[PDB]
Amino acid sequence: MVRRDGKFVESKSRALFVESTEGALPSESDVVIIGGGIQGIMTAINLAERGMSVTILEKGEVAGEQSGRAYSQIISYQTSPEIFPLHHYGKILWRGMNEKIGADTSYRTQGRVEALADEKALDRAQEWIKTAKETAGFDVPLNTRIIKGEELSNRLVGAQTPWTVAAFEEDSGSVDPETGTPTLARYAKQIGVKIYTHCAVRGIETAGGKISDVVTEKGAIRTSNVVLAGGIWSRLFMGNMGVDLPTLNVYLSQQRVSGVPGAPRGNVHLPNGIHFREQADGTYAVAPRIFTSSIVKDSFLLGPKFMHLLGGGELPLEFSIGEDLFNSFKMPTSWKLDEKSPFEQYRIATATQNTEHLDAVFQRMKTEFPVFEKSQIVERWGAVVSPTFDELPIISEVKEYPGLVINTATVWGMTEGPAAGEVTADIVTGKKPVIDPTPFSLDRFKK
Numbered sequence: 435m436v437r438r439d440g441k442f443v444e445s446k447s448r449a450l451f452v453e454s455t456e457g458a459l460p461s462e463s464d465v466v467i468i469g470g471g472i473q474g475i476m477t478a479i480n481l482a483e484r485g486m487s488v489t490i491l492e493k494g495e496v497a498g499e500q501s502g503r504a505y506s507q508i509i510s511y512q513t514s515p516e517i518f519p520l521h522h523y524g525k526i527l528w529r530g531m532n533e534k535i536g537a538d539t540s541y542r543t544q545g546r547v548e549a550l551a552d553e554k555a556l557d558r559a560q561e562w563i564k565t566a567k568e569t570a571g572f573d574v575p576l577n578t579r580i581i582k583g584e585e586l587s588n589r590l591v592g593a594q595t596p597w598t599v600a601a602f603e604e605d606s607g608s609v610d611p612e613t614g615t616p617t618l619a620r621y622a623k624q625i626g627v628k629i630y631t632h633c634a635v636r637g638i639e640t641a642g643g644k645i646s647d648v649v650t651e652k653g654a655i656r657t658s659n660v661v662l663a664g665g666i667w668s669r670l671f672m673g674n675m676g677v678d679l680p681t682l683n684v685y686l687s688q689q690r691v692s693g694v695p696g697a698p699r700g701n702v703h704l705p706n707g708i709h710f711r712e713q714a715d716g717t718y719a720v721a722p723r724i725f726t727s728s729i730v731k732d733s734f735l736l737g738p739k740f741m742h743l744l745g746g747g748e749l750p751l752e753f754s755i756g757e758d759l760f761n762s763f764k765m766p767t768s769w770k771l772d773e774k775s776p777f778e779q780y781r782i783a784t785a786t787q788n789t790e791h792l793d794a795v796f797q798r799m800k801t802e803f804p805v806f807e808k809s810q811i812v813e814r815w816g817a818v819v820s821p822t823f824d825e826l827p828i829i830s831e832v833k834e835y836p837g838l839v840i841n842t843a844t845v846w847g848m849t850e851g852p853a854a855g856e857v858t859a860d861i862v863t864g865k866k867p868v869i870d871p872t873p874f875s876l877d878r879f880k881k
């Protein structure tokens with residue numbers, strides 16, 4: 435029997451509140467950014483630091499969706515050669531972020547121990563580490579190695595399973611998503627970025643080959659440069675402009691549990707379904723790392739490209755069916771700019787949490803680490819991500835709409851955000867990007 439519980443719902447933010455910029459929308463701005471998640475915020479910061487006027491529009495709240503809900507481990511381990519620089523450099527930038535902003539984002543360098551199950555897992559770790567070490571850029575060496583024996587058991591204090599070997603990303607980072615993006619938004623505002631919350635962008639008005647303005651629910655702003663960083667909504671937005679983004683929604687659940695004395699520090703990943711990350715506030719983030727695909731219209735429209743991972747391949751995925759299916763066929767995929775858009779209905783969207791998944795991981799954690807028998811659930815939530823089918827983000831100009839740049843479709847945006855924000859700013863301004871964005875182009879879906 436297929437599950438019936440996964441559901442797309444309107445919700446509230448779980449992240450720190452960020453006040454809207456006061457007053458009327460500006461009549462013009464050098465750049466307008468659609469979306470107040472980490473991608474929109476980091477892009478805005480990079481552009482404002484280069485002297486451009488920037489206005490962010492956010493339909494709900496800052497970090498209301500993915501950026502406020504992430505497990506939020508900041509890592510480079512096992513990344514592809516195309517993605518690795520984005521993560522390596524993202525981490526470099528995160529390590530300088532508190533200094534840059536003059537505040538605490540909650541970013542901490544904490545280290546990540548991933549126990550390895552067998553020789554094949556060990557071989558794969560050693561091979562990645564070897565290759566990553568030689569290509570590590572930005573004059574910063576890779577700080578990832580294999581550990582064992584006394585050192586490993588010290589890291590995994592109290593572990594009931596006698597783990598023998600592990601990959602150790604010693605400089606892995608952590609940011610608490612309730613804190614990070616909102617703190618960055620406050621900094622953006624300090625350097626002159628205007629941020630208007632409860633303000634949906636319905637569309638972009640363009641003629642000849644030139645953007646003239648963005649149309650919001652509260653009026654229009656003149657500009658010839660637009661960044662779409664709309665998270666899971668980017669596909670829908672671009673569909674209204676006749677451009678296809680091949681992204682598919684996936685539902686996730688997350689929780690925080692209370693810290694206890696004797697718990698392992700930092701970030702732990704065990705192959706028996708245990709994944710936790712110590713937060714700056716002393717609680718522990720605990721991820722089931724199980725994916726739920728709620729069957730919708732787009733499951734059929736994009737199925738072929740995903741199939742090597744959508745219900746195929748050996749990844750921990752589950753199908754769900756429910757109201758989403760019928761609702762997905764009712765969701766309009768085009769709207770006039772003078773009428774109510776779907777964005778004004780679902781301002782802070784998420785998926786309902788899976789309590790069974792969250793209970794299961796927490797139990798497994800308690801068995802492996804008995805000190806957590808005295809820990810209790812602090813908070814639980816659901817979330818939606820929207821990857822592409824090829825494990826690469828979309829950071830790209832839109833050839834059909836000169837002036838439009840997209841920064842979206844990543845499941846590693848907490849890590850990538852600072853780097854992708856700089857890359858996006860470079861694309862916007864016509865500067866040679868700090869990282870070659872060719873692999874992240876929309877051109878790769880052509881033909």
Ligand SMILES: Cc1cc2nc3c(=O)[nH]c(=O)nc-3n(C[C@H](O)[C@H](O)[C@H](O)COP(=O)(O)OP(=O)(O)OC[C@H]3O[C@@H](n4cnc5c(N)ncnc54)[C@H](O)[C@@H]3O)c2cc1C
Pocket residue numbers: 468469470471472473474491492493494495496497498499500501502503504505506507508509633634635636663664665666667668671686687688777781782817818819841842843844845846847848849850
């Ligand atoms: C459960 C979970 C765990 C994760 N764990 C990790 C991790 O461990 N490490 C890691 O690096 N990454 C992780 N991620 C990924 C990371 O959270 C995302 O990749 C990142 O938050 C994406 O940022 P974004 O700004 O593109 O999207 P979002 O944070 O979703 O922001 C997009 C914003 O745009 C707004 N918006 C959309 N359309 C419009 C419109 N038309 N007008 C106005 N506003 C609009 C939305 O309301 C939203 O706030 C995780 C994600 C999830 C869901």
Ligand SMILES: Nc1ccccc1C(=O)O
Pocket residue numbers: 505506507686721723819845846
């Ligand atoms: N990076 C992610 C993206 C989506 C879901 C889980 C994770 C995770 O790291 O656990």
